[PDB]
Nucleic acid binder design. Structure first.
Ligand code: MG
Ligand code: MG
Ligand code: MG
Ligand code: MG
Ligand code: MG
Ligand code: MG
Ligand code: MG
Ligand code: MG
Ligand code: MG
Ligand code: MG
Ligand code: MG
Ligand code: MG
Ligand code: MG
Ligand code: MG
Ligand code: MG
Ligand code: MG
Ligand code: MG
Ligand code: MG
Ligand code: ZN
Ligand code: ZN
Lengths: 61, 128, 81, 104, 232, 135
RNA sequence: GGUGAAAUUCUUGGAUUUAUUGAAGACUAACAACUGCGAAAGCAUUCGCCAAGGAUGUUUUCAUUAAUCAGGAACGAAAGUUAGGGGAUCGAAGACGAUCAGAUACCGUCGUAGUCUUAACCAUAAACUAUGCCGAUUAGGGAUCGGACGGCGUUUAUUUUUGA
């Protein structure tokens, strides 16, 4: 599968029923113009790098 | 980390009573406060010296409302007698052509009162 | 207010009130004589005429009735009598 | 007791008005009593606007708009959080709320 | 879901043998009438002609929705879509003629607004060539630049005056015309400017438009006229 | 196999997306309804009744539609999305946008956006009663 | 299909979906408002015909002809009744599927009377502004619908006077 690498640029509060998930703005590190919103389970800092199996799906708000 | 009223009142009264002898340096105010005050706690003396040195950092750059010291008041009443040599209302000098502009029924009001000799020019105003 | 002379209101205020709400009612309608361009005759016509007024000569219309005061023909002149 | 001077209806000078159907539970309420909201939005969401733009075949393109007018009964009004309970003094204020124009 | 079928094919059935029905299809081109700029409008698909099943019979009652902007190569008329009905199919070349006109839904909903007055009318008409077609018209009240009053409402007595003037004008314009001449009159929006000019005295009435046109009856086929308009 | 055309030109089809609140339908024709190029629905893609109308299922249904229509030769699409209409919600369902994005991302071309939801001028009485669904 | 989730139900005897055509009955979206009319109940697609009404304008006409009313009389939503026509959609009664300890209910699929109209009865509603009808006086404001009167301008037409 064409797995893609994305990096987080900003964190926008903590969502979810139990605060485990966080909602972030990510950057694809291959087309620096593109940016979407995703959800993450673990702690996240600025300039962290995440591995994304599928990118089309989008999260709430 | 919020300071209570006892420090707030003590810092204000010390600053306004004794402004010039103490400066932005915290170390100096530490020894200034306890010599000229009766304080029963060392940490409380630190509390006062630490907050009081904060005030002069922002007073040095622009005045702040709610605080007044001896040097500060005297500046106000020396500055408040400022007055130009020609009045802003006066127009004999301010306007090149002494004669001024009014509207029609104002000129009619002058006619009613009898002060016709005032040199003015009337211009109509209406948009509708 | 609290001190007014009701006996001598201003003429503007009585030209400003309703025709029935003045101190004494007085009509604001009038008669007029119209000069038809074609002839030299004179006809007396009410200002609020409800009927078409015909001149004695040449049988021409002089006014058209309306809701308020009758409208005169464009090519006509009148003086308030 | 009167809770509201206008009986919460806005109807003075007539006897009857035809009802309408609630857009959520299909209830019938008078038209003057129902809450009316007019909404103007885009066909596609802001993240997808570019994807449509570069997938179009008309060079520059302007996505069309979408217009709806929804209307609810009062029971669905405060359950969908469209409006909420106000205080006794704040009830008599019919000015529309000032929408935020800076968004921090 | 795969596992919800209970009777499947039903009481008793068996699987099929031959599939992929697209091996027997054919492609045809579609053209446009004379007044329009571009003639090619796309391609169409149909089963291949065979015994007992002629192909031409299936390509004689089809209609297509084509936006007028594509036909005229102009983005100003981007809110009007028209129908084309196929009549005769020359070899690898479908020929069509006029079948109607209509606005898009979003433009129509974007025009209607609160605190204004909406005027609407319709009328049937027949041409010198025996075509019976119906036209709809619409207009709205116009605000004045120096207006302070919140709402612009017209009196119903005036409304009937506009409706009468529009109907009389539309009938007069469509009294002596042919379909080619009339279509040449819709695309420059000729009708609107006389409607607004004539009703100018009663009320401004901005945005005068003809909402839609639909035809009800047709005369004999008369292939000579169709070939007259096609193949120019 | 496909319509012969020069490489510069591109041929058009039309996709009619029906997005209700219980299921989503993607159906592609050829500028007329007589001939159906392909049709797929969320039900095949999903494995559970609950998710038959989900955006993810609509995306999956749009992917194999694009794949299936690629070899037919059609290269550009017009779209006509519609909701239930009539006495329905008249608001497109959640799986509306999803499939449209998946169509754009898969490589398909887009033109002439439109909405074709049917609206009544004055309808018959609608189901529910005078008191509505009281749950 | 439908739901918080399912089932009853329809489907290669081609369900659901796409386009074209035809018939039938009901209803008049958006414009539609702290806006209009009527004694109230009530009244919204176009046009033709019939009689009726309020307000304004008036140096027309009669000259107390008036106000409220025990008994009495006309109209009077929805549902309901008696005879014909019509019977699309919803849907009392009824029959099934779920939930629940039980569920003759709330949820879902069907479905009779009824829902429409013609000719006659019935006379009750939170029929509410919970506020009887006529007449006089009492405080500031700004909107708004209909008629009349005065005025500076703009717009515009076979254009002026009119209309906005
Ligand atoms: Mg009234
Ligand atoms: Mg009532
Ligand atoms: Mg509840
Ligand atoms: Mg079928
Ligand atoms: Mg019908
Ligand atoms: Mg009105
Ligand atoms: Mg209507
Ligand atoms: Mg009695
Ligand atoms: Mg009844
Ligand atoms: Mg009945
Ligand atoms: Mg019998
Ligand atoms: Mg019967
Ligand atoms: Mg039920
Ligand atoms: Mg039913
Ligand atoms: Mg009673
Ligand atoms: Mg009572
Ligand atoms: Mg009463
Ligand atoms: Mg005037
Ligand atoms: Zn004469
Ligand atoms: Zn509701």
């Amino acid at each position: 599968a064409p797995v893609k690498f994305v990096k987080v640029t900003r964190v926008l509060g903590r969502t979810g029923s139990r605060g485990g998930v966080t909602q972030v703005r990510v950057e694809f590190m291959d087309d620096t113009t593109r940016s979407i919103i995703r959800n993450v389970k673990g702690p996240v800092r600025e300039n962290d790098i995440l591995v994304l199996l599928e990118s089309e799906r989008e999260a709430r708000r | 980390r919020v300071r209570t009223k006892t420090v707030k009142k003590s810092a204000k009264v010390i600053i306004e009573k004794y402004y010039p002898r103490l400066t932005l340096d915290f170390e100096t105010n530490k020894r200034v406060c306890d010599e000229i005050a009766v304080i029963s706690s060392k940490r409380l003396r630190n509390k006062i010296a630490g907050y009081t040195t904060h005030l002069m950092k922002r007073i040095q750059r622009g005045p702040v409302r709610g605080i007044s010291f001896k040097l500060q008041e005297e500046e106000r009443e020396r500055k408040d007698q400022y007055v130009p040599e020609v009045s802003a209302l006066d127009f004999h000098q301010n306007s090149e052509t002494g004669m001024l502009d009014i509207d029609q029924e104002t000129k009619d009001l002058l006619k009613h009162l009898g002060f016709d000799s005032i040199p003015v020019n009337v211009i109509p105003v209406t948009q509708s | 207010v609290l001190a007014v002379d009701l006996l001598n209101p201003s003429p503007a205020s009585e030209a400003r009130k309703h025709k029935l709400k003045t101190l004494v009612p007085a009509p604001r309608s009038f008669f007029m004589d119209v000069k038809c361009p074609g002839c030299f005759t004179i006809t007396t016509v009410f200002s609020h005429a409800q009927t078409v007024v015909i001149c004695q000569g040449c049988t021409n219309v002089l006014c058209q009735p309306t809701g308020g005061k009758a409208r005169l023909t464009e090519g006509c002149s009148f003086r308030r009598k | 007791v009167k809770k509201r001077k206008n009986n919460g209806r806005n109807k003075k000078g007539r006897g009857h008005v035809k009802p309408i159907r609630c857009s959520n539970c299909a209830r019938c309420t008078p038209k003057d009593k129902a809450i009316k909201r007019f909404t103007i939005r885009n066909m596609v969401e802001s993240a997808a606007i570019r994807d449509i733009s570069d997938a179009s075949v008309f060079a520059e393109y302007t996505v069309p708009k979408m217009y709806l007018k929804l209307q609810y009964c009062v029971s669905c009004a405060i359950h969908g959080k469209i409006v909420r309970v106000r205080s006794r003094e704040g009830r008599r204020n019919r000015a529309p709320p000032p929408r935020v124009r800076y968004n921090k | 879901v795969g596992k919800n079928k209970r009777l499947s094919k039903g009481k008793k059935g068996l699987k099929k043998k031959v599939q992929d029905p697209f091996t027997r299809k054919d492609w045809y081109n579609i053209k446009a009438p004379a007044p329009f700029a571009v003639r090619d409008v796309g391609k169409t698909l149909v089963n291949r002609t065979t015994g007992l099943k002629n192909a031409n019979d299936a390509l004689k009652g089809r209609i297509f929705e084509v936006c007028l902007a594509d036909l005229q190569k102009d983005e100003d008329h981007a809110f009007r879509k028209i129908k084309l009905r196929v009549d005769e199919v020359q070899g690898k070349n479908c020929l069509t003629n006029f079948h109607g006109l209509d606005f898009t839904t979003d433009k129509l909903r974007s025009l209607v607004r609160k605190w204004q007055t909406l005027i609407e009318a319709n009328v049937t008409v027949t041409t010198t060539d025996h075509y019976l077609l119906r036209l709809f018209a619409i207009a709205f009240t116009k605000r004045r630049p120096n207006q302070i009053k919140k709402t612009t409402y017209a009196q119903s007595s005036q409304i009937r005056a506009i409706r009468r003037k529009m109907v009389e004008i539309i009938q007069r314009e469509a009294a002596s015309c042919t379909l080619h001449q009339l279509v040449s009159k819709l695309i420059p929006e000729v009708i609107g400017r006389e409607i607004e000019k004539a009703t100018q005295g009663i009320y401004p009435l901005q945005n005068v438009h003809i909402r839609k046109v639909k035809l009800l009856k047709q005369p004999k086929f008369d292939l000579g006229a169709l070939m007259a308009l096609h193949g120019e | 196999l496909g319509p012969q055309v020069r490489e510069g030109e591109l041929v058009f089809g039309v996709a009619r997306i029906f997005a209700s609140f219980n299921d989503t339908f993607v159906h592609v024709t050829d500028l007329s309804g007589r001939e159906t190029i392909c049709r797929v629905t969320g039900g095949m893609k999903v494995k559970a009744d609950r998710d038959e109308s989900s955006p993810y299922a609509a995306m999956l249904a749009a992917q194999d539609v694009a794949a299936r229509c690629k070899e037919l030769g059609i290269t550009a699409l017009h779209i006509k999305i519609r909701a239930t209409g009539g006495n329905g919600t008249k608001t497109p369902g959640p799986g509306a946008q999803s499939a449209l994005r998946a169509l754009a991302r898969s490589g398909m071309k887009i033109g002439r956006i439109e909405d074709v939801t049917p609206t009544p001028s004055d309808s018959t009485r609608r189901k529910g009663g005078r008191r509505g669904r009281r749950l």
